[PDB]
Amino acid sequence: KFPRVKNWEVGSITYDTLSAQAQQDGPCTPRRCLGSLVFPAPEQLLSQARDFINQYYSSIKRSGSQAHEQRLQEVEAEVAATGTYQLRESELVFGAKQAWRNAPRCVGRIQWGKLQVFDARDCRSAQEMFTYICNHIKYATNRGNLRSAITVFPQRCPGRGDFRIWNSQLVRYAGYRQQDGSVRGDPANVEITELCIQHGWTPGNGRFDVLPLLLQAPDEPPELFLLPPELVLEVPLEHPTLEWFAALGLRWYALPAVSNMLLEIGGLEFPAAPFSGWYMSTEIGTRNLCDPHRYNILEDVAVCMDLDTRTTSSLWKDKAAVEINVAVLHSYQLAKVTIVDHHAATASFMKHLENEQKARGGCPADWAWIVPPISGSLTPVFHQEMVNYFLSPAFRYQPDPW
Amino acid sequence: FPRVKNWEVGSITYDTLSAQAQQDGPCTPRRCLGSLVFPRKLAPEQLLSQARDFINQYYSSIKRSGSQAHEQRLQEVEAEVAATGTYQLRESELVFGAKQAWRNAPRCVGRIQWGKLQVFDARDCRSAQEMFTYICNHIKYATNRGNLRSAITVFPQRCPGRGDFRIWNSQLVRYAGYRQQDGSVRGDPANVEITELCIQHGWTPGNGRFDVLPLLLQAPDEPPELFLLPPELVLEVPLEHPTLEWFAALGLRWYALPAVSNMLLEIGGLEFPAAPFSGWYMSTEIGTRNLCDPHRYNILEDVAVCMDLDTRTTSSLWKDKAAVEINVAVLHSYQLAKVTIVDHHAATASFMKHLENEQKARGGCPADWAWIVPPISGSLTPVFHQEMVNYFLSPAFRYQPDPW
Numbered sequence: 183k184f185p186r187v188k189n190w191e192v193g194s195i196t197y198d199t200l201s202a203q204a205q206q207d208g209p210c211t212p213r214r215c216l217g218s219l220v221f222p223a224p225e226q227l228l229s230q231a232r233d234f235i236n237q238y239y240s241s242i243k244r245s246g247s248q249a250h251e252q253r254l255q256e257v258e259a260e261v262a263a264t265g266t267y268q269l270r271e272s273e274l275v276f277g278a279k280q281a282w283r284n285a286p287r288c289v290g291r292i293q294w295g296k297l298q299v300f301d302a303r304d305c306r307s308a309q310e311m312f313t314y315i316c317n318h319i320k321y322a323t324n325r326g327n328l329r330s331a332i333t334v335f336p337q338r339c340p341g342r343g344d345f346r347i348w349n350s351q352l353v354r355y356a357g358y359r360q361q362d363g364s365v366r367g368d369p370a371n372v373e374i375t376e377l378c379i380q381h382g383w384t385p386g387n388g389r390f391d392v393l394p395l396l397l398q399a400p401d402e403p404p405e406l407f408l409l410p411p412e413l414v415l416e417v418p419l420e421h422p423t424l425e426w427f428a429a430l431g432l433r434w435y436a437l438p439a440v441s442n443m444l445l446e447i448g449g450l451e452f453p454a455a456p457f458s459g460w461y462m463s464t465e466i467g468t469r470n471l472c473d474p475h476r477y478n479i480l481e482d483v484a485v486c487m488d489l490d491t492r493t494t495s496s497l498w499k500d501k502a503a504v505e506i507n508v509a510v511l512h513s514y515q516l517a518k519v520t521i522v523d524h525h526a527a528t529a530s531f532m533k534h535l536e537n538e539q540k541a542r543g544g545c546p547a548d549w550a551w552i553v554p555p556i557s558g559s560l561t562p563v564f565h566q567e568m569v570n571y572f573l574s575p576a577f578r579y580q581p582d583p584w
Numbered sequence: 585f586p587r588v589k590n591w592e593v594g595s596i597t598y599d600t601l602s603a604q605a606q607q608d609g610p611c612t613p614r615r616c617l618g619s620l621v622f623p624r625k626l627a628p629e630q631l632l633s634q635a636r637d638f639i640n641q642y643y644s645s646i647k648r649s650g651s652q653a654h655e656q657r658l659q660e661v662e663a664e665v666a667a668t669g670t671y672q673l674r675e676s677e678l679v680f681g682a683k684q685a686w687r688n689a690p691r692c693v694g695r696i697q698w699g700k701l702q703v704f705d706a707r708d709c710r711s712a713q714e715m716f717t718y719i720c721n722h723i724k725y726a727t728n729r730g731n732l733r734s735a736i737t738v739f740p741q742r743c744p745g746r747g748d749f750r751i752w753n754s755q756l757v758r759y760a761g762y763r764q765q766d767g768s769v770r771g772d773p774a775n776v777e778i779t780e781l782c783i784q785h786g787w788t789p790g791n792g793r794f795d796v797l798p799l800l801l802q803a804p805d806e807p808p809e810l811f812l813l814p815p816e817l818v819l820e821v822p823l824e825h826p827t828l829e830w831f832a833a834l835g836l837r838w839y840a841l842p843a844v845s846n847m848l849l850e851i852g853g854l855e856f857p858a859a860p861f862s863g864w865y866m867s868t869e870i871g872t873r874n875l876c877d878p879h880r881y882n883i884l885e886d887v888a889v890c891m892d893l894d895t896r897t898t899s900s901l902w903k904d905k906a907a908v909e910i911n912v913a914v915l916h917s918y919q920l921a922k923v924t925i926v927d928h929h930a931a932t933a934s935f936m937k938h939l940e941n942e943q944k945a946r947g948g949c950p951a952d953w954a955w956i957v958p959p960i961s962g963s964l965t966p967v968f969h970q971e972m973v974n975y976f977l978s979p980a981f982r983y984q985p986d987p988w
């Protein structure tokens with residue numbers, strides 16, 4: 183009773199034996215599927231640890247060995263003495279890559295083995311935290327030739343508060359409410375904008391103002407840090423044939439760096455471990471610029487394209503959306519900033535599924551997030567059945583610290 | 585009671601209808617199988633319990649529970665089963681059940697129309713030639729010279745032992761799929777299997793790329809016979825593009841009527857292996873799936889060449905550009921031919937309205953996100969940012985085996 187999985191474009195059939203090792207539970211039952219939902223002491227800690235150590239010593243082709251049982255013994259002992267334990271640096275690097283490998287909504291996982299892991303577990307203050315983060319952005323950005331990286335700040339521990347980054351990403355544009363009641367800038371960031379302001383930030387008045395970082399050291403209020411402007415690489419948006427497009431004044435930033443998730447490794451939790459890769463072009467063109475509740479530029483673009491916005495059957499929305507994505511891809515290519523289109527991304531993810539089926543006998547994947555938000559059935563992932571389940575190590579959502 | 589959020593507007597509801605479900609779906613707390621096309625794979629004490637439930641919701645809907653003529657229908661059904669083991673549906677229950685099965689179909693985006701359904705009762709049928717005449721009435725009525733009307737024809741229910749009425753084609757109108765020299769196909773690769781059962785039962789093959797296949801109708805026990813569809817009864821649309829002069833030269837056509845003829849209508853514990861239903865097309869069905877799927881007519885590159893697109897790099901979005909124009913041509917061609925069609929923007933906006941209606945009426949609506957979101961421009965439609973709950977209600981259209 184392993185789930186049969188078929189690709190309907192090709193006829194391929196595989197069975198997902200890895201789903202049976204699903205170490206935690208999701209929102210569905212045989213009664214009802216909730217898959218489309220966005221948001222779905224020593225004893226428990228010890229069994230998560232053993233399982234991880236077992237994964238680690240499996241990875242280095244040394245399972246059941248002297249060093250393996252030694253480490254198992256050491257951890258049980260350390261959990262007894264201290265209520266927790268510390269990862270070796272090599273185990274941390276393995277745990278970070280596994281968390282990415284296990285991330286079911288990530289279409290970029292072909293890259294999972296090429297992750298740069300910065301060990302900031304010795305961080306002591308928000309000021310030091312800032313320095314680490316500035317170094318992360320600099321290395322990952324690499325002048326436009328982007329590299330995947332994660333920085334791990336100290337784990338959660340009894341008796342002390344968490345390191346937390348309040349910003350959902352290291353680079354975000356501000357969202358300012360208006361007299362029209364409207365939002366100027368990115369409506370997704372209204373809340374964090376208001377927090378920065380009341381923590382002493384002097385707001386701008388533009389549409390693409392980079393937000394400061396609110397960094398929280400254990401048992402301190404958050405501290406405001408401005409990003410040096412020369413650290414935040416940005417791409418002005420132009421279209422290769424639509425010359426008035428450059429006159430919209432649109433821009434986006436190079437580095438997508440998610441900073442508000444919790445990294446979990448062997449029962450240990452790291453509430454602050456921001457990670458970054460590079461953008462797939464629909465994230466910018468379709469979601470960030472075209473969503474009605476984001477920058478919502480679609481109608482303004484279609485009107486300038488001289489399209490008939492009076493009826494839906496002319497597909498003015500689809501035509502304007504495609505050209506916005508073309509503009510994104512062309513602009514990042516022009517600027518020499520890494521970018522991947524959804525055709526290339528989904529093709530590599532299909533190679534990733536093949537690799538994972540041989541390696542682990544399956545691959546956790548969230549169809550609704552893996553299939554891009556435009557041209558879905560034109561990509562190979564559309565016709566591929568997928569099994570969604572939760573493996574550890576893992577990135578998890580966590581509540582906002584405020 | 586699942587919380588259900590719309591991330592575009594921020595509105596919240598609670599799906600209370602989900603609790604009243606349950607033919608068991610495929611998901612478990614440890615793994616979601618929501619993307620699987622077939623939920624896994626395919627002494628009558630429980631016939632009564634399914635009939636009582638159905639009868640109860642028929643009288644619920646007509647303001648008529650607790651007094652009444654519903655207690656009397658309750659007893660005639662159990663006397664009927666106590667006597668013959670099965671039972672016959674009143675004609676209005678049959679109408680009510682057919683509409684409820686459509687209303688309950690999680691994968692159907694067109695359900696705002698679920699109240700306008702023409703139900704032809706064909707249970708007194710007994711010959712495959714009769715069937716062909718029923719099917720021919722339906723098609724004629726449903727087509728209505730291009731002003732399509734939703735319709736289902738309900739054939740005799742499966743009964744203890746005996747045999748099955750069964751249409752063998754997957755739809756009433758299907759184009760031919762001829763394998764070949766290369767192991768390649770001319771026509772529709774989706775219909776290769778049935779194109780060969782047609783010829784192995786006596787059909788003379790045809791031209792190629794757009795040959796309406798003949799019907800394979802199976803009366804109980806008796807083996808299936810072939811029937812030719814009159815070209816007068818099969819309305820078709822030549823595809824042309826409003827501004828791309830050469831598009832008509834590609835010789836593309838599609839048919840007017842989508843009529844699913846292989847699913848099993850189940851009402852109150854009764855099974856109807858032959859109950860073809862029909863509506864009208866959403867344009868992405870034709871242009872995106874049927875014409876552009878790599879395993880269907882696979883025309884994307886041909887159109888891209890004619891548009892002189894940069895097919896040498898994926899980042900030109902030449903697939904995306906070509907695909908939109910094929911959809912523009914589908915819509916324009918149906919409109920010019922005055923054949924009812926609906927685009928995915930209009931269709932999903934109507935579905936959002938359906939969701940609002942269903943929340944007031946029944947406290948929710950089973951919906952399959954992966955099938956409700958259109959196959960192109962998903963996030964541009966209002967259903968993309970709408971969370972949905974999938975579950976099985978009865979009456980339903982179910983998948984069923986294939987008599988091969």
Ligand code: HEM
Pocket residue numbers: 278282285287288289290291293297330331332440457458459460461462464465522527551552554555577
């Ligand atoms: C290197 C290139 C990468 C690409 C192209 C990529 C792509 C994506 C995309 C497209 C999504 C969400 C679907 C969407 O927004 O349309 C996503 C989600 C995600 N990615 Fe990747 N990613 C990359 C690197 C990484 C790295 C380095 C990590 C962690 C080490 C990671 C972990 C995740 C996680 C956890 C999610 C889900 C986030 C959430 O649910 O909020 N990704 N990725």
Ligand code: HEM
Pocket residue numbers: 682686689691692693694695697701734735736861862863864865866869926931955956957958959981
């Ligand atoms: C009248 C206009 C109708 C429209 C526009 C429509 C549209 C659709 C679409 C678009 C799908 C599949 C999703 C996709 O391919 O993207 C679908 C599936 C379905 N529809 Fe509707 N439909 C209509 C009428 C009907 C009627 C009259 C019935 C039944 C009486 C029905 C029952 C179903 C069922 C059972 C499915 C699922 C089929 C399967 O699982 O293979 N629909 N419909």
Ligand SMILES: Cc1cc(N)nc(CCc2cc(F)cc(CC[C@H]3CCCN3)c2)c1
Pocket residue numbers: 220438439440457458459460461462465579
């Ligand atoms: C490292 C990385 C690279 C990349 N190229 N892309 C991403 C995904 C960015 C992203 C995409 C989304 F679609 C939504 C979010 C925020 C998700 C919040 C909302 C609900 C739960 N978490 C972030 C991450």
Ligand SMILES: Cc1cc(N)nc(CCc2cc(F)cc(CC[C@H]3CCCN3)c2)c1
Pocket residue numbers: 190564565566567568619620621954955
């Ligand atoms: C993962 C996935 C998601 C989605 N949203 N859609 C699909 C394809 C649905 C589909 C459409 C068709 F048009 C035909 C088939 C298979 C029919 C074959 C199998 C047996 C007999 N005929 C499947 C797959």
Ligand SMILES: Cc1cc(N)nc(CCc2cc(F)cc(CC[C@H]3CCCN3)c2)c1
Pocket residue numbers: 621622842843844861862863864865866869
């Ligand atoms: C009445 C009606 C109107 C309309 N406008 N559209 C449809 C949908 C036709 C359709 C769409 C699909 F996407 C797949 C199928 C058949 C595939 C089989 C294999 C597995 C499940 N069904 C049929 C039906």
Ligand SMILES: Cc1cc(N)nc(CCc2cc(F)cc(CC[C@H]3CCCN3)c2)c1
Pocket residue numbers: 218219220469550551591968969970971972
């Ligand atoms: C049903 C559905 C399917 C899908 N495939 N995608 C979505 C949108 C998911 C999404 C993307 C974003 F980019 C941002 C959010 C909300 C983030 C809010 C919550 C808390 C803080 N910000 C949600 C919805």
Ligand SMILES: [Cl-]
Pocket residue numbers: 438465470
């Ligand atoms: Cl983003």
Ligand SMILES: [Cl-]
Pocket residue numbers: 842869874
């Ligand atoms: Cl079809």
Ligand SMILES: [Gd]
Pocket residue numbers: 423424425
């Ligand atoms: Gd131009």
Ligand SMILES: [Gd]
Pocket residue numbers: 892893894
């Ligand atoms: Gd060319």
Ligand SMILES: [Zn+2]
Pocket residue numbers: 210211214215216217611612615616617618
């Ligand atoms: Zn599920």
Ligand SMILES: [Zn+2]
Pocket residue numbers: 468469473963969
């Ligand atoms: Zn969106």
Ligand SMILES: [Zn+2]
Pocket residue numbers: 559565872873877
């Ligand atoms: Zn398809």
